[PDB]
Design a protein around this ligand. Sequence first.
Ligand SMILES: CC(C)(C)c1ccc(N(C(=O)c2c[nH]cn2)[C@@H](C(=O)NC2CCCCC2)c2cccnc2)cc1
Ligand SMILES: CC(C)(C)c1ccc(N(C(=O)c2c[nH]cn2)[C@@H](C(=O)NC2CCCCC2)c2cccnc2)cc1
Ligand SMILES: [Cl-]
Ligand SMILES: [Cl-]
Ligand code: NA
Ligand code: NA
Lengths: 305, 306
Amino acid sequence: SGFRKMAFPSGKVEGCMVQVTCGTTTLNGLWLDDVVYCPRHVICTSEDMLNPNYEDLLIRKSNHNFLVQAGNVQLRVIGHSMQNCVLKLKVDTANPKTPKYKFVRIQPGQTFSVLACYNGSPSGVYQCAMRPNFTIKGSFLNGSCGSVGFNIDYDCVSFCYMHHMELPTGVHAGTDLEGNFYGPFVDRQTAQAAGTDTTITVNVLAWLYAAVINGDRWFLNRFTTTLNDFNLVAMKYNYEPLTQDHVDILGPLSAQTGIAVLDMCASLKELLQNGMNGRTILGSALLEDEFTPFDVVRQCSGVTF
Amino acid sequence: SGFRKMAFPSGKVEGCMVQVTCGTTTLNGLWLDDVVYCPRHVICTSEDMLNPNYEDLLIRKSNHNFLVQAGNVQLRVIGHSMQNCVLKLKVDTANPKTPKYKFVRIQPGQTFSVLACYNGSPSGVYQCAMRPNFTIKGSFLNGSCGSVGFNIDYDCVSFCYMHHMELPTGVHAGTDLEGNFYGPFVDRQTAQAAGTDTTITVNVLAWLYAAVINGDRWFLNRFTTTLNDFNLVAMKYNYEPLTQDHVDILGPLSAQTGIAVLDMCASLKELLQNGMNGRTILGSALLEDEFTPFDVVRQCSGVTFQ
Ligand SMILES: CC(C)(C)c1ccc(N(C(=O)c2c[nH]cn2)[C@@H](C(=O)NC2CCCCC2)c2cccnc2)cc1
Ligand SMILES: CC(C)(C)c1ccc(N(C(=O)c2c[nH]cn2)[C@@H](C(=O)NC2CCCCC2)c2cccnc2)cc1
Ligand SMILES: [Cl-]
Ligand SMILES: [Cl-]
Ligand code: NA
Ligand code: NA
């Protein structure tokens, strides 16, 4: 029993974190086999950051410009290149702790664990979601750049996020591990802002199912709805549209609890139109949207890695 | 910026988790040096969970009645002893991944990370607090027993909790790593139930300081309060008493933000009176009480967003 915001165990990732230093700038890198991955903005000076020519800054650099530290051991850099917004430093030693891994690009609404690091040292782990506006509501201080986000499947780490920068509202922007940004952001000091966000409907429904599994049922009702009628309500309340694929993905939880997705949609419709009337759901007074259907099934079934 | 429920990196504990089987029962153990720690109720029979006598049950066991599996390796048990409600199995191999560690018994209101495990394998990590009623609001399924809670300040793992059982409201009870239960609970099947719980006041105040550090002041007011008037009011909402020790603990956050502790108490009194009027604090619409003062200082910037 119980239901918590839960992260993946972080050990396989902890063994990959290194410190990367270029000039006066230090941040984190991801050491996998004989390559260290980090944000290319490590090579920027205060001056370059307004309008960096990354092509030209990089050719100006040489291998010896980069200091890579794995705990107390210096790793010797023997090559360097850029892929999109990620710098790749070839080192002379393959990481003996490299896990089975893949680089994956996630979709808005999907969740992942973040291992927050400073000076190459893991500091904390938390769970978060890729927002519909392609930001993440992280917890990151100066020097957190290069921290990564990931999911695990059995023994395989799927790296999906590398942290690059903070936006004015205090949310965060980054790339996949191939250096492609999530969202319409650029790695330079310029006017950029998070766009208006929306709530991840399929995840709210998954969490309502989690609540029912855990005994919270006051919001259930006799009514059902249709996708079209519900999506007009969703649009009204700045919720993402619910697609047929979402309904199918929630099909498991629907059979276990007896609440068809469109039955549960009728509960959510009423919660949106009328509020919670002073009650809570799973210990929250807000509708929580950072649990995916798979997160709920995994936590409610005890999947291990 | 931002503010999350943040656990410690779990790798140092993952390397200690094993599976212990006795008879038909499997649960988790903690392998440190040449000892595996687990709940002594692993030796309880299915036919008598109401009044086990653990001394009599254990004297009947041979070392080979305990099966310990570390990943794909069977560890040989070469001795056993019981300490309070914890069983200590001596094994023939020391864990080569044993971290620097200590055992600490914590006080209500303290927080820690939990590595939830099944069959000796980690499932996930989350943050908990020891509630005033000596339960934790965990997320634990059948067979989670022997999962542990811990902090890792300054690269030393302080183990403070071993999970033993689920209570009727779905909250959780367990021991320190010396096998003494938190609270009045016992490791047998009884009618035991958690007491009425209360809100951890010093932690709510810590979290309000976090909100100010991260740039949000909307809930402050022009008033102050005496400590005794604050407690008289707060207890009417089932908040724990705030002690002078708590006021001292909040000194650093008060200094960083320029908000006197009793002025933040006055803000909390008004929030209890008024609610949030459709606003949120650090993304929550309720007052959060599972961040300690130490936790806030660990996570938040040293410079207030004025
Ligand atoms: C060069 C570039 C792209 C402009 C940049 C500059 C600084 C950083 N930030 C580093 O802390 C940092 C950089 N190198 C080592 N640390 C921080 C950051 O985003 N402030 C932004 C402030 C607005 C203008 C853009 C930069 C940061 C803080 C907290 C959490 N995340 C990141 C990130 C990117
Ligand atoms: C023998 C004893 C002390 C009565 C006992 C029995 C079972 C367990 N529980 C094991 O799952 C378990 C035991 N051994 C392997 N798994 C579970 C548990 O507490 N149910 C309780 C149900 C009410 C009566 C007391 C036991 C459990 C479930 C979810 C999370 N936490 C634990 C714990 C203790
Ligand atoms: Cl460029
Ligand atoms: Cl303590
Ligand atoms: Na590789
Ligand atoms: Na309904």
